[PDB]
Structure formats: structure tokens, C-alpha cells
Coordinates of C-alpha atoms and ligand atoms in Angstrom, one line a residue:
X1 CA 13.7 102.2 102.5
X2 CA 11.6 101.1 105.6
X3 CA 11.7 101.4 109.3
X4 CA 10.2 99.4 112.2
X5 CA 10.2 100.4 115.9
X6 CA 8.6 99.0 119.0
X7 CA 6.3 101.4 120.9
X8 CA 5.8 100.7 124.7
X9 CA 3.2 102.0 127.1
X10 CA 4.6 104.4 129.6
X11 CA 2.6 103.0 132.5
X12 CA 0.1 100.3 133.5
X13 CA -2.9 102.3 132.0
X14 CA -1.5 102.9 128.5
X15 CA -1.6 106.7 129.2
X16 CA 0.8 107.1 126.3
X17 CA 3.3 105.2 124.3
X18 CA 7.0 105.9 123.8
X19 CA 9.2 104.9 120.9
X20 CA 13.0 105.1 120.8
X21 CA 14.4 107.6 118.3
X22 CA 18.1 108.1 117.5
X23 CA 19.1 111.8 117.1
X24 CA 22.6 113.1 116.1
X25 CA 26.1 111.7 115.6
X26 CA 27.0 109.7 117.6
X27 CA 23.4 108.7 118.2
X28 CA 21.6 110.1 121.2
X29 CA 18.5 107.9 121.9
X30 CA 15.4 109.6 123.3
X31 CA 12.0 108.0 124.0
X32 CA 9.5 110.1 122.1
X33 CA 5.7 110.1 122.0
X34 CA 4.6 109.6 118.4
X35 CA 1.7 111.9 117.9
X36 CA -0.5 111.7 114.7
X37 CA -2.4 114.8 116.0
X38 CA 0.6 117.2 115.9
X39 CA 3.5 118.0 113.6
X40 CA 6.5 119.1 115.7
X41 CA 9.4 116.9 116.6
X42 CA 10.6 118.4 119.9
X43 CA 12.8 117.2 122.6
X44 CA 14.0 117.9 126.1
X45 CA 17.5 119.2 125.6
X46 CA 20.6 120.8 127.1
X47 CA 18.8 124.1 126.6
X48 CA 15.8 123.2 128.6
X49 CA 15.4 125.3 131.8
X50 CA 17.0 123.1 134.4
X51 CA 14.2 123.3 137.0
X52 CA 11.8 121.9 134.3
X53 CA 13.8 118.7 133.7
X54 CA 13.1 115.8 136.1
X55 CA 14.5 112.5 134.9
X56 CA 14.1 112.9 131.1
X57 CA 16.9 112.1 128.7
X58 CA 18.0 115.2 126.9
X59 CA 19.4 115.9 123.5
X60 CA 22.6 117.9 123.6
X61 CA 23.2 119.3 120.1
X62 CA 26.8 120.4 121.0
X63 CA 27.7 116.8 121.3
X64 CA 26.4 116.0 117.8
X65 CA 28.8 116.5 114.8
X66 CA 25.8 116.6 112.5
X67 CA 23.7 119.2 114.4
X68 CA 23.3 122.7 112.9
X69 CA 21.4 125.6 114.4
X70 CA 18.5 126.6 112.2
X71 CA 19.3 130.2 112.6
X72 CA 16.4 132.4 113.7
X73 CA 13.9 129.7 113.9
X74 CA 11.6 129.3 117.0
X75 CA 8.7 127.2 117.9
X76 CA 5.9 127.2 120.4
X77 CA 3.0 124.7 120.8
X78 CA 0.0 124.1 123.0
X79 CA -1.8 120.8 123.3
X80 CA -5.3 119.8 124.1
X81 CA -4.8 119.4 127.9
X82 CA -3.3 122.9 128.2
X83 CA 0.3 121.7 128.3
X84 CA 2.9 123.5 126.2
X85 CA 6.5 123.8 125.2
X86 CA 8.7 126.2 123.2
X87 CA 12.3 126.8 122.1
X88 CA 14.7 127.0 119.1
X89 CA 15.6 124.6 116.3
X90 CA 18.5 122.5 115.1
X91 CA 18.7 120.3 112.0
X92 CA 20.2 116.9 112.6
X93 CA 20.1 113.2 111.5
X94 CA 17.1 111.3 113.0
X95 CA 16.6 107.6 112.7
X96 CA 13.5 105.6 113.7
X97 CA 13.7 101.8 113.6
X98 CA 16.5 101.8 111.0
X99 CA 15.0 104.5 108.8
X100 CA 17.2 107.6 108.6
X101 CA 16.3 111.2 107.7
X102 CA 19.1 113.8 107.3
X103 CA 18.4 117.4 107.9
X104 CA 15.4 116.8 110.1
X105 CA 14.2 119.8 112.2
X106 CA 14.7 118.9 115.8
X107 CA 13.0 121.4 118.0
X108 CA 14.9 121.9 121.2
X109 CA 12.8 122.9 124.2
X110 CA 13.9 125.9 126.2
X111 CA 10.6 125.7 128.2
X112 CA 8.1 123.0 128.9
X113 CA 5.0 123.1 131.1
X114 CA 4.6 121.3 134.4
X115 CA 2.8 118.2 132.9
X116 CA 5.8 117.5 130.7
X117 CA 8.3 118.0 133.6
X118 CA 6.3 115.7 135.8
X119 CA 6.4 112.8 133.3
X120 CA 9.9 111.5 133.4
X121 CA 9.1 108.8 130.8
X122 CA 8.5 111.1 127.8
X123 CA 11.6 112.8 126.3
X124 CA 9.7 114.6 123.6
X125 CA 7.2 114.3 120.8
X126 CA 7.4 113.2 117.2
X127 CA 4.6 114.7 115.3
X128 CA 3.0 112.6 112.4
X129 CA 0.1 114.9 111.4
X130 CA 0.4 117.0 108.3
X131 CA 3.3 119.5 108.1
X132 CA 0.9 122.4 107.7
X133 CA 0.5 122.2 111.5
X134 CA 4.2 122.5 112.2
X135 CA 4.8 125.6 114.5
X136 CA 8.3 126.6 113.5
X137 CA 8.6 130.2 112.5
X138 CA 9.4 132.0 110.3
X139 CA 10.1 128.9 108.1
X140 CA 7.7 126.1 108.7
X141 CA 9.3 122.6 108.9
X142 CA 8.4 119.2 107.7
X143 CA 7.6 116.1 109.8
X144 CA 9.8 113.1 109.9
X145 CA 7.3 111.2 107.8
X146 CA 7.1 114.0 105.2
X147 CA 10.9 114.1 105.0
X148 CA 11.2 110.3 104.7
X149 CA 8.3 109.8 102.3
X150 CA 10.1 110.0 99.0
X151 CA 12.7 107.4 100.1
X152 CA 10.1 104.9 101.5
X153 CA 9.1 101.8 99.6
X154 CA 5.5 102.9 100.0
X155 CA 4.4 106.4 101.3
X156 CA 2.8 105.0 104.5
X157 CA 3.3 104.4 108.1
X158 CA 1.3 102.1 110.4
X159 CA 0.3 102.1 114.0
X160 CA -0.2 98.9 115.9
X161 CA -0.6 99.8 119.5
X162 CA -0.9 97.2 122.2
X163 CA -3.3 96.9 125.1
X164 CA -1.2 96.8 128.2
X165 CA 1.6 95.6 125.9
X166 CA 4.2 96.8 123.4
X167 CA 3.3 97.4 119.8
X168 CA 4.9 98.6 116.6
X169 CA 5.3 101.7 114.3
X170 CA 6.3 100.7 110.8
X171 CA 7.3 103.2 108.0
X172 CA 7.2 102.4 104.3
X173 CA 5.5 99.0 104.4
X174 CA 2.4 97.2 105.5
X175 CA 3.1 94.0 107.6
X176 CA 0.5 91.6 106.3
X177 CA 1.1 89.3 109.3
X178 CA 0.1 92.0 111.8
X179 CA -3.6 92.0 111.2
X180 CA -6.6 89.7 110.5
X181 CA -9.0 89.8 107.6
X182 CA -8.7 92.8 105.2
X183 CA -7.8 96.5 105.6
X184 CA -10.7 98.8 105.0
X185 CA -9.7 102.2 103.7
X186 CA -11.6 105.4 104.2
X187 CA -11.2 109.0 103.0
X188 CA -9.2 111.6 104.8
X189 CA -9.6 115.4 104.9
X190 CA -6.4 117.3 105.5
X191 CA -8.2 120.7 105.7
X192 CA -7.5 121.0 109.5
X193 CA -4.0 119.4 109.2
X194 CA -5.2 116.1 110.9
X195 CA -5.8 112.6 109.8
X196 CA -9.5 113.4 109.8
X197 CA -12.1 110.8 108.6
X198 CA -15.7 109.9 109.0
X199 CA -16.8 106.8 111.0
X200 CA -20.0 105.2 109.8
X201 CA -21.5 104.6 113.2
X202 CA -21.3 102.7 116.4
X203 CA -22.7 100.0 118.7
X204 CA -22.6 99.5 122.4
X205 CA -21.9 95.9 123.6
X206 CA -24.1 93.4 121.8
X207 CA -26.5 96.2 120.8
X208 CA -27.6 97.0 117.3
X209 CA -25.4 99.1 115.1
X210 CA -26.4 102.8 114.7
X211 CA -25.6 104.1 111.3
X212 CA -24.5 107.7 111.7
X213 CA -21.6 109.8 110.4
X214 CA -19.0 110.7 113.0
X215 CA -16.2 113.0 111.8
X216 CA -13.0 112.7 113.9
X217 CA -9.3 112.4 113.9
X218 CA -7.0 109.4 114.2
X219 CA -4.8 110.5 117.0
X220 CA -2.1 108.4 118.6
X221 CA -1.2 111.3 120.9
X222 CA -4.5 111.3 122.7
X223 CA -5.1 108.6 125.3
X224 CA -8.9 108.3 125.2
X225 CA -11.8 108.1 122.8
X226 CA -13.7 111.4 122.6
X227 CA -17.1 111.2 120.8
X228 CA -20.3 113.3 120.7
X229 CA -22.2 113.5 123.9
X230 CA -25.2 111.5 122.5
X231 CA -22.9 108.6 121.7
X232 CA -21.1 108.7 125.0
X233 CA -24.3 108.9 127.0
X234 CA -25.6 105.8 125.2
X235 CA -22.5 103.9 126.1
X236 CA -22.4 104.8 129.8
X237 CA -26.1 104.2 130.2
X238 CA -25.3 100.5 129.9
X239 CA -23.0 100.6 133.0
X240 CA -24.8 100.5 136.3
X241 CA -23.7 103.4 138.5
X242 CA -21.9 105.3 135.7
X243 CA -22.2 109.0 135.8
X244 CA -20.6 112.2 134.4
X245 CA -18.7 113.9 137.2
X246 CA -17.8 117.6 136.9
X247 CA -15.5 117.3 139.9
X248 CA -13.5 114.5 138.2
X249 CA -13.9 115.9 134.7
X250 CA -15.7 113.1 132.9
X251 CA -17.6 109.9 133.1
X252 CA -16.7 107.6 136.0
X253 CA -18.1 104.2 136.8
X254 CA -17.9 101.7 139.7
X255 CA -14.7 99.8 139.7
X256 CA -16.8 96.7 140.3
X257 CA -18.3 97.0 136.8
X258 CA -17.8 94.8 133.8
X259 CA -17.7 97.2 130.9
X260 CA -19.4 96.5 127.6
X261 CA -17.5 96.7 124.3
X262 CA -17.8 99.6 121.9
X263 CA -17.9 99.1 118.2
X264 CA -17.1 101.8 115.6
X265 CA -17.7 101.7 111.8
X266 CA -15.1 102.1 109.1
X267 CA -17.1 102.0 105.9
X268 CA -18.9 98.7 106.0
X269 CA -16.4 97.2 108.4
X270 CA -16.4 97.2 112.2
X271 CA -13.7 97.6 114.8
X272 CA -14.6 96.3 118.3
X273 CA -13.0 97.8 121.3
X274 CA -13.2 95.3 124.2
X275 CA -14.7 96.6 127.5
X276 CA -11.4 96.2 129.3
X277 CA -9.7 98.8 127.0
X278 CA -12.2 101.4 128.3
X279 CA -11.1 101.0 132.0
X280 CA -8.6 103.7 133.1
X281 CA -8.7 102.6 136.8
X282 CA -9.3 104.4 140.0
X283 CA -9.7 108.2 139.9
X284 CA -7.3 108.4 142.8
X285 CA -5.2 105.7 144.5
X286 CA -7.5 103.3 146.3
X287 CA -10.8 104.8 145.1
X288 CA -13.7 102.6 144.1
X289 CA -14.6 105.1 141.3
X290 CA -12.9 104.3 138.0
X291 CA -12.3 106.7 135.1
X292 CA -13.9 105.9 131.7
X293 CA -12.0 105.6 128.5
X294 CA -14.8 107.0 126.4
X295 CA -15.5 110.6 127.0
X296 CA -17.5 113.4 125.5
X297 CA -15.8 115.6 122.9
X298 CA -18.3 118.5 123.6
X299 CA -15.7 120.7 125.2
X300 CA -13.0 120.1 122.4
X301 CA -14.5 121.0 119.1
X302 CA -13.5 117.8 117.4
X303 CA -14.0 114.1 117.9
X304 CA -10.9 112.1 118.6
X305 CA -10.2 108.5 117.9
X306 CA -7.3 108.2 120.4
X307 CA -5.4 105.3 121.7
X308 CA -8.4 103.5 123.2
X309 CA -9.8 103.2 119.7
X310 CA -6.6 102.8 117.7
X311 CA -5.1 100.1 119.9
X312 CA -8.1 97.8 118.9
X313 CA -6.9 98.0 115.2
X314 CA -4.0 97.8 112.8
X315 CA -4.1 101.4 111.4
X316 CA -2.6 102.5 108.1
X317 CA -1.7 106.2 107.6
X318 CA -1.5 106.4 103.8
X319 CA 0.4 109.5 102.8
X320 CA -0.1 109.1 99.1
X321 CA -1.0 112.1 97.0
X322 CA -4.5 111.6 98.1
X323 CA -4.2 110.5 101.7
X324 CA -6.4 107.8 103.2
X325 CA -6.7 105.8 106.5
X326 CA -6.9 102.0 106.7
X327 CA -8.3 100.0 109.6
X328 CA -8.0 96.2 110.1
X329 CA -8.9 94.0 113.1
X330 CA -6.0 92.2 114.7
Ligands
46W1 C1 -6.3 118.5 119.8 C2 -5.2 118.8 120.7 C3 -3.8 118.5 120.1 N1 -3.8 117.2 119.5 C4 -2.7 116.4 119.6 N2 -1.5 117.0 119.8 N3 -2.7 115.1 119.5 C5 -4.9 116.8 118.7 C6 -6.3 117.1 119.4
46W2 C1 2.2 114.0 125.9 C2 1.4 115.0 125.1 C3 0.6 114.3 124.0 C4 -0.2 115.2 123.2 N1 -1.1 116.0 124.1 C5 -2.5 116.0 123.9 N2 -3.1 115.1 123.1 N3 -3.2 116.9 124.5 C6 -0.4 116.7 125.1 C7 0.4 115.8 125.9

């Protein structure tokens, strides 16, 4: 089997991407944030505290003939920005882009933090990291990809995120029309439950490439590119007026700037992130200070190749017995 679904930025800055997902019988379509950095499929629901729902589409298990309470199971998750959600669990039929999994754990939110409430465009998350990170207790649950894998033509999914445009998530096949040149594959460590790999270095603009190992994760659920302070300082030093602002919480730059590109290494290959991809616009409406798309990972404990990086590539998440990651230009 295979599946193919379009993923769409939630706003003009590509702050996140949503993908329609069918849950239950008859289908209830919710727009979920596919997140290769977590492993819970959770949704706004009829059980979500009413004051914490503001425009989201909800899953109502009582209206699904295939929903079953997973008795006793609860979940609770916190994300990197301090946001969180928790609730109980149903199993139900879940389809993405024509690919169907029966008996998928659908984590129904009883509580969500303010950031989630305040974003009416995201109806939940669909985690695509390794199932060892799944938070369901007392019986840990599998991701949609883990459940689908045996039925897939090939045990892979691909992320093809657009810059200020829609893109595609494919399951079970590699679309050889979706990228240019060849795909370079690189080793993955699953020790922390992430798609963790080691980049071979970087360049800033037309500068010389610096060979240096940068361990990090391929994370569709993070907006920006978070790298070591040394690397990030070298980037922003090439932009007149750029500075790290503690009041804003990162590097900002004059909105009048033309940003340089940023290149990262994948083996002997190179992925170039155009300068424009690194512009996240005014820090507040009407400001002439703009927020940078490359930020230090110093306060995080891991480097994160988030959407800024991933949307410059066609990315293969290979869930074979020995997992790997593939990157191609496009
Ligand atoms: C850390 C915080 C959680 N992450 C995530 N859900 N994408 C991964 C990075
Ligand atoms: C919408 C959610 C995506 C995952 N998160 C994160 N990387 N910190 C939390 C917000």
C-alpha cells in the first residue's frame, strides 16, 4: 500500500504545516501537524475542556462506529516551547492520503495549553518519530507509520515541504519526480527516539564550506533551524545590523537586509537553504526588526534541523530495520 497527502503552511511565514487526516467511521477530517520529532497522534476532541477550544475541528469518538476506548490508558506530553496536552485514548481507523491503519491509537485531549488553543489552524499532532517516545501509559502505543509499515510497499515516508507553498507527505514510496539529482543517505541513531543524524558541515552564503560534524534531528514539527552557537554566530555576522536579542529571544536582523543562503552537508552532498527561507518577518506588527530563521540550540540540548532546513530538500525517512535518512535537492 501507499499514501500521499498534501501538506499546507498554516500562515504566511510557514510557522507549521497541516495535513488532512481521516479519523473514524464515517470519516472525521482533522488537520494535523505531522511531527517527526514526537510520537503521539493526539487530537482536539469532544472531551477537550470547552474553554480551551477556539475554532479547532474536534474528533468526537461517540460518532464513530469504529472507535473503542482504550480502557485505562492516558497520555501527557510537553513540547520544546513549553506547550503541552493530555487526555485519554481511543483506538480507531485512521487514513492519510488513502493509506488506512485500523486500530490506531488516537489520543483524545482533555486539556491543551494556551498556545494550542490560540492556534485555530492545528487540530492535533501526528507523531512520526520512533514509537519509543510515545507517552501513552501504562501500555505504550505505536505511531501511524509504525502501524502502517508492514503494509507499505517500502518502509519509508517522505517529507517534501514547500516554501510559502503546499508540499507533500508520501508513505510507502519514493516519488522520483519530486527531486533533482540523487538522494544521499546518511546514518540514523534511534537512541534518543529521534531521526538523529550527523551533518558533515556548513557554509554561509558563497563562503567556503567548513567540514565539521553536527549531530541533530530531522524535525518537521519545529519551525526553525537550531544549530550550535558558533555556527549561528558565523551566519549572522554576515548580515549588517544582526544581533542576538535577549528581549526578543533570538537573533533579529534589519528587515531591510538581504539574507545570505546557508548550506548544510549530508555526506559529500550539500543542501542549500536560500536566504529568503531564513526570514521570519517583523518581530511585531510593523516593526523594522525581523526574526531570524537560524537560531542557537544552546538552550535546548540538541540541534534541530527543522522546517527551515527540511523545506530546502526532499527528505526520505527510511524506517527499514536499520533506519536511515535521505536528502535530495529539489
Ligand atoms: C525537542 C522538543 C520536542 N520536539 C518535537 N515535538 N518536535 C523535538 C525537539
Ligand atoms: C504545534 C507543536 C509542534 C511541536 N512543538 C515543538 N516543536 N515545540 C510544539 C508545538
